[PDB]
Structure 1
Amino acid sequence: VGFELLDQEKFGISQFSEQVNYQRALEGELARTIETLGPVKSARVHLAMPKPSLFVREQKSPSASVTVTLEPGRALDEGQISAVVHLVSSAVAGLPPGNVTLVDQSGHLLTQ
Protein backbone atom coordinates (compact mmCIF):
# COMPACT_ATOMS: atom_id res chain seq x y z
CA VAL A 1 0.00 0.00 0.00
CA GLY A 2 2.73 2.49 1.03
CA PHE A 3 1.50 6.11 0.63
CA GLU A 4 -1.89 4.60 -0.37
CA LEU A 5 -2.27 3.28 3.23
CA LEU A 6 -1.62 6.89 4.36
CA ASP A 7 -4.24 8.01 1.79
CA GLN A 8 -6.91 5.70 3.32
CA GLU A 9 -7.94 8.92 5.18
CA LYS A 10 -7.68 7.13 8.57
CA PHE A 11 -7.23 8.91 11.96
CA GLY A 12 -3.58 8.76 13.08
CA ILE A 13 -3.95 7.57 16.71
CA SER A 14 -0.67 9.39 17.48
CA GLN A 15 2.72 10.64 16.17
CA PHE A 16 3.91 7.05 16.84
CA SER A 17 1.11 5.77 14.56
CA GLU A 18 2.17 8.37 11.94
CA GLN A 19 5.82 7.18 12.21
CA VAL A 20 4.80 3.49 11.80
CA ASN A 21 2.71 4.41 8.71
CA TYR A 22 5.67 6.35 7.20
CA GLN A 23 8.04 3.38 7.81
CA ARG A 24 5.56 0.98 6.14
CA ALA A 25 5.01 3.27 3.09
CA LEU A 26 8.78 3.65 2.49
CA GLU A 27 9.19 -0.15 2.76
CA GLY A 28 6.40 -0.66 0.20
CA GLU A 29 7.76 1.80 -2.41
CA LEU A 30 11.32 0.43 -2.06
CA ALA A 31 10.12 -3.17 -2.56
CA ARG A 32 8.11 -1.87 -5.56
CA THR A 33 11.14 -0.33 -7.35
CA ILE A 34 13.28 -3.43 -6.51
CA GLU A 35 10.67 -5.73 -8.18
CA THR A 36 10.39 -3.39 -11.21
CA LEU A 37 14.03 -4.33 -12.04
CA GLY A 38 14.31 -7.10 -14.67
CA PRO A 39 15.62 -10.20 -12.74
CA VAL A 40 13.39 -9.52 -9.64
CA LYS A 41 9.90 -11.10 -9.49
CA SER A 42 9.01 -9.84 -5.98
CA ALA A 43 10.83 -7.90 -3.24
CA ARG A 44 10.34 -7.55 0.54
CA VAL A 45 12.05 -4.70 2.48
CA HIS A 46 12.24 -4.48 6.28
CA LEU A 47 13.54 -1.27 7.86
CA ALA A 48 14.79 -0.91 11.44
CA MET A 49 14.92 2.77 12.44
CA PRO A 50 17.20 2.99 15.57
CA LYS A 51 16.55 4.64 19.00
CA PRO A 52 18.68 7.03 21.20
CA SER A 53 20.05 6.18 24.67
CA LEU A 54 19.45 8.19 27.85
CA PHE A 55 22.71 9.96 28.81
CA VAL A 56 24.99 8.41 26.12
CA ARG A 57 26.16 10.81 23.37
CA GLU A 58 27.42 7.59 21.61
CA GLN A 59 25.18 7.04 18.55
CA LYS A 60 24.28 4.18 16.13
CA SER A 61 22.48 3.98 12.72
CA PRO A 62 19.46 2.33 10.96
CA SER A 63 19.47 -1.11 9.26
CA ALA A 64 17.66 -2.77 6.34
CA SER A 65 16.91 -6.36 5.26
CA VAL A 66 15.95 -6.96 1.63
CA THR A 67 14.63 -10.32 0.41
CA VAL A 68 14.34 -10.76 -3.38
CA THR A 69 12.62 -13.50 -5.35
CA LEU A 70 14.28 -13.89 -8.76
CA GLU A 71 12.76 -15.00 -12.07
CA PRO A 72 13.57 -18.72 -12.86
CA GLY A 73 17.41 -18.67 -13.07
CA ARG A 74 17.72 -14.85 -13.20
CA ALA A 75 20.88 -14.53 -11.02
CA LEU A 76 21.60 -10.91 -9.89
CA ASP A 77 24.83 -9.23 -11.12
CA GLU A 78 27.51 -7.98 -8.73
CA GLY A 79 26.70 -4.52 -10.12
CA GLN A 80 23.02 -5.36 -9.52
CA ILE A 81 23.69 -6.19 -5.85
CA SER A 82 25.58 -2.86 -5.71
CA ALA A 83 22.68 -0.81 -7.19
CA VAL A 84 20.11 -2.43 -4.83
CA VAL A 85 22.43 -1.52 -1.93
CA HIS A 86 22.75 2.11 -3.12
CA LEU A 87 18.97 2.59 -3.61
CA VAL A 88 17.99 1.13 -0.20
CA SER A 89 20.75 3.07 1.63
CA SER A 90 19.79 6.42 0.00
CA ALA A 91 16.04 5.95 0.72
CA VAL A 92 16.72 5.84 4.51
CA ALA A 93 18.07 9.00 6.19
CA GLY A 94 21.60 8.11 7.37
CA LEU A 95 21.53 4.45 6.28
CA PRO A 96 25.16 3.19 6.05
CA PRO A 97 25.21 0.77 3.05
CA GLY A 98 27.13 -1.79 5.15
CA ASN A 99 23.88 -2.14 7.23
CA VAL A 100 21.85 -3.30 4.16
CA THR A 101 21.48 -7.09 3.88
CA LEU A 102 20.30 -8.54 0.53
CA VAL A 103 19.08 -12.19 0.46
CA ASP A 104 17.53 -14.39 -2.26
CA GLN A 105 14.51 -16.77 -2.15
CA SER A 106 16.84 -19.72 -1.23
CA GLY A 107 18.49 -17.89 1.73
CA HIS A 108 21.78 -16.98 -0.04
CA LEU A 109 23.23 -13.70 1.21
CA LEU A 110 23.90 -11.63 -1.97
CA THR A 111 25.67 -8.84 -0.01
CA GLN A 112 28.43 -9.29 2.64
Structure 2
Amino acid sequence: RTLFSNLSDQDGGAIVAQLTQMNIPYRFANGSGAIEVPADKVHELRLRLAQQGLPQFSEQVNYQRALEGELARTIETLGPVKSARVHLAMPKPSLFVREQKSPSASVTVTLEPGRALDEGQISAVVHLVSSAVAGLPPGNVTLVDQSGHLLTQ
Protein backbone atom coordinates (compact mmCIF):
# COMPACT_ATOMS: atom_id res chain seq x y z
CA ARG A 1 0.00 0.00 0.00
CA THR A 2 0.93 3.60 -0.58
CA LEU A 3 3.03 5.02 2.20
CA PHE A 4 3.41 8.45 0.57
CA SER A 5 2.56 9.99 -2.75
CA ASN A 6 3.52 13.17 -4.38
CA LEU A 7 6.93 13.39 -2.71
CA SER A 8 9.80 15.61 -3.69
CA ASP A 9 12.86 13.79 -4.87
CA GLN A 10 14.57 14.94 -1.68
CA ASP A 11 11.85 13.64 0.53
CA GLY A 12 11.59 10.50 -1.45
CA GLY A 13 15.22 9.80 -1.20
CA ALA A 14 15.18 10.46 2.60
CA ILE A 15 12.22 8.18 3.01
CA VAL A 16 13.88 5.40 1.01
CA ALA A 17 17.04 5.74 3.04
CA GLN A 18 15.09 5.34 6.25
CA LEU A 19 13.15 2.34 4.94
CA THR A 20 16.39 0.63 3.97
CA GLN A 21 17.90 1.30 7.34
CA MET A 22 14.84 -0.24 9.03
CA ASN A 23 15.03 -3.20 6.60
CA ILE A 24 11.50 -2.57 5.36
CA PRO A 25 10.67 -3.70 1.78
CA TYR A 26 9.37 -0.86 -0.48
CA ARG A 27 8.37 -0.16 -4.12
CA PHE A 28 8.56 3.47 -5.39
CA ALA A 29 5.64 3.74 -7.85
CA ASN A 30 7.22 4.45 -11.28
CA GLY A 31 6.84 8.20 -12.02
CA SER A 32 3.94 8.23 -9.53
CA GLY A 33 6.06 9.99 -6.87
CA ALA A 34 4.54 7.38 -4.52
CA ILE A 35 6.05 4.53 -2.40
CA GLU A 36 3.78 1.47 -1.94
CA VAL A 37 4.95 -0.46 1.20
CA PRO A 38 3.74 -3.50 3.23
CA ALA A 39 0.04 -2.85 3.85
CA ASP A 40 0.26 -3.87 7.54
CA LYS A 41 3.12 -1.42 8.12
CA VAL A 42 1.78 1.65 6.44
CA HIS A 43 0.51 3.48 9.49
CA GLU A 44 3.35 2.57 11.79
CA LEU A 45 5.82 3.68 9.19
CA ARG A 46 4.05 6.97 8.60
CA LEU A 47 4.26 7.74 12.23
CA ARG A 48 7.87 6.63 12.55
CA LEU A 49 8.86 8.75 9.61
CA ALA A 50 6.95 11.70 11.01
CA GLN A 51 8.99 11.33 14.17
CA GLN A 52 12.15 11.78 12.07
CA GLY A 53 10.56 14.81 10.39
CA LEU A 54 9.83 13.10 7.10
CA PRO A 55 8.44 14.17 4.79
CA GLN A 56 -16.93 19.31 -4.94
CA PHE A 57 -17.70 20.71 -1.48
CA SER A 58 -18.71 17.33 -1.03
CA GLU A 59 -15.59 16.21 -2.68
CA GLN A 60 -13.55 18.70 -0.79
CA VAL A 61 -15.60 17.86 2.11
CA ASN A 62 -15.25 14.33 1.24
CA TYR A 63 -11.69 14.79 0.59
CA GLN A 64 -11.31 16.67 3.76
CA ARG A 65 -13.28 14.06 5.55
CA ALA A 66 -11.20 11.33 3.97
CA LEU A 67 -8.00 13.06 4.91
CA GLU A 68 -9.22 13.59 8.42
CA GLY A 69 -10.13 9.98 8.65
CA GLU A 70 -6.78 8.79 7.39
CA LEU A 71 -4.86 11.06 9.69
CA ALA A 72 -6.95 9.80 12.58
CA ARG A 73 -6.26 6.26 11.69
CA THR A 74 -2.55 6.87 11.47
CA ILE A 75 -2.52 8.64 14.87
CA GLU A 76 -4.43 5.71 16.41
CA THR A 77 -1.53 3.43 15.69
CA LEU A 78 0.31 5.18 18.57
CA GLY A 79 0.38 2.90 21.63
CA PRO A 80 -1.04 5.33 24.17
CA VAL A 81 -3.90 6.45 21.79
CA LYS A 82 -7.26 4.64 22.07
CA SER A 83 -8.96 6.87 19.53
CA ALA A 84 -8.24 10.05 17.50
CA ARG A 85 -10.30 12.66 15.71
CA VAL A 86 -8.85 15.16 13.28
CA HIS A 87 -10.67 18.29 12.09
CA LEU A 88 -9.16 20.28 9.24
CA ALA A 89 -10.38 23.87 8.84
CA MET A 90 -8.99 25.40 5.58
CA PRO A 91 -11.11 28.55 4.84
CA LYS A 92 -12.84 28.39 1.41
CA PRO A 93 -10.69 30.24 -1.22
CA SER A 94 -10.21 33.54 0.70
CA LEU A 95 -13.29 35.54 -0.45
CA PHE A 96 -11.82 38.72 1.14
CA VAL A 97 -9.21 40.07 -1.34
CA ARG A 98 -6.90 41.98 1.08
CA GLU A 99 -7.09 39.71 4.20
CA GLN A 100 -4.94 36.50 4.07
CA LYS A 101 -6.04 33.11 5.57
CA SER A 102 -4.16 29.89 6.57
CA PRO A 103 -5.23 26.24 7.20
CA SER A 104 -5.43 24.94 10.74
CA ALA A 105 -6.02 21.53 12.30
CA SER A 106 -7.49 20.38 15.60
CA VAL A 107 -6.53 16.91 16.83
CA THR A 108 -8.39 15.30 19.74
CA VAL A 109 -7.03 12.11 21.24
CA THR A 110 -8.55 9.65 23.74
CA LEU A 111 -5.74 8.10 25.63
CA GLU A 112 -5.65 4.67 27.29
CA PRO A 113 -6.22 4.89 30.95
CA GLY A 114 -3.09 5.75 32.72
CA ARG A 115 -1.15 6.46 29.52
CA ALA A 116 0.26 9.76 28.16
CA LEU A 117 1.78 10.95 25.03
CA ASP A 118 5.50 11.78 25.30
CA GLU A 119 7.06 14.87 23.66
CA GLY A 120 8.29 12.84 20.73
CA GLN A 121 4.89 11.33 20.02
CA ILE A 122 3.31 14.74 20.30
CA SER A 123 5.79 16.19 17.83
CA ALA A 124 5.16 13.27 15.43
CA VAL A 125 1.42 13.92 15.46
CA VAL A 126 1.91 17.62 14.81
CA HIS A 127 4.29 16.93 11.95
CA LEU A 128 2.13 14.23 10.42
CA VAL A 129 -0.90 16.52 10.29
CA SER A 130 1.09 19.57 9.06
CA SER A 131 2.73 17.63 6.30
CA ALA A 132 -0.51 16.21 5.07
CA VAL A 133 -2.09 19.58 4.39
CA ALA A 134 -0.67 22.15 2.07
CA GLY A 135 0.18 25.37 3.81
CA LEU A 136 -0.56 24.08 7.28
CA PRO A 137 2.21 25.19 9.55
CA PRO A 138 3.01 23.08 12.63
CA GLY A 139 2.09 25.99 14.71
CA ASN A 140 -1.46 25.85 13.45
CA VAL A 141 -1.94 22.29 14.77
CA THR A 142 -3.64 22.04 18.13
CA LEU A 143 -3.46 18.72 19.91
CA VAL A 144 -5.83 18.14 22.88
CA ASP A 145 -6.76 15.12 24.96
CA GLN A 146 -10.27 13.86 26.02
CA SER A 147 -10.18 16.11 29.02
CA GLY A 148 -9.46 19.14 26.79
CA HIS A 149 -5.81 19.40 27.99
CA LEU A 150 -3.66 21.14 25.35
CA LEU A 151 -0.75 18.92 24.54
CA THR A 152 0.89 21.13 21.93
CA GLN A 153 2.81 24.07 23.44
TM-score (norm 1): 0.81
Is the 1:52–1:59 Cα contact (8 Å) retained in structure 2?
A: no
Distance 1:79 1:10, change over 3 A: closer
| TM-score (ref. length: structure 2) | 0.60
TM-superposed deviation, 1:58: 4.3
Deviation (angstroms), 1:12: 36
Q: Which moved more, 1:16-25 or 1:26-35?
A: 16-25
> Is the contact made by 2:51 and 2:120 (CA closer than 8 Å) also made in structure 1?
no
Q: Match for residue 66 of structure 1?
A: 107
- Provide the residue aligned with 1:54 in structure 2: 95
- Partner deviation per Cα, 1:15-60 (whole Å, 9 max, x = no partner): 2221111000000000001011111010010010123445625422
- Specify whether residues 11 and 54 from structure 1 end up closer, same or farther in structure 2 by C-alpha distance, changes over 3 A only: farther
Cα separation, partners in 2 of 1:23 and 1:12, compared to 1, 3 Å:
farther
Q: Is the 8 A contact 2:50 2:125 kept in 1?
A: no
Q: 1:10 to 1:25 in 2, by over 3 A?
A: farther
Task: Describe the shift of the 1:7–1:19 C-alpha distance in structure 2 as closer, same or farther (beyond 3 A).
Answer: farther
Which of 110, 118, 124 aligns to 1:83? It is: 124
Q: 1:111 to 1:7 in 2, by over 3 A?
A: closer
Give, in angstroms, the shift of residue 76 of structure 1. Answer: 0.6
Match of 1:11 in 2: 52
Change beyond 3 A, Cα 1:74–1:90? same
Q: Shift of the alpha carbon at 1:71? A: 1.0
Which has the larger displacement, 8-17 or 29-38?
8-17
Q: CA deviation at 1:107?
A: 1.1
Q: Is 2:138 the partner of 1:94? A: no
Unpaired runs of at least 5, structure 1: none
Query: How high is the sequence identity, in percent, across the aligned residues?
Result: 94
Question: Does the aligned pair in 1 maintain the 2:107–2:144 contact within 8 Å?
Answer: yes
Is the 1:12–1:18 Cα contact (8 Å) retained in structure 2?
Answer: no
Instruction: Name structure 2 gaps, 5 residues minimum.
Output: 1-43
Q: What is the DSSP-based 3-state SS (H/G/I as helix, E as strand, rest coil) of the residue aligned with 1:67?
A: strand
Q: Cα gap change, 1:12/1:54 in structure 2, threshold over 3 Å: closer, same or farther?
A: farther
Q: Distance in 2 between matches of 1:102 and 1:9?
A: 15
**In the comparison of the two structures, how many residue pairs are matched?**
109
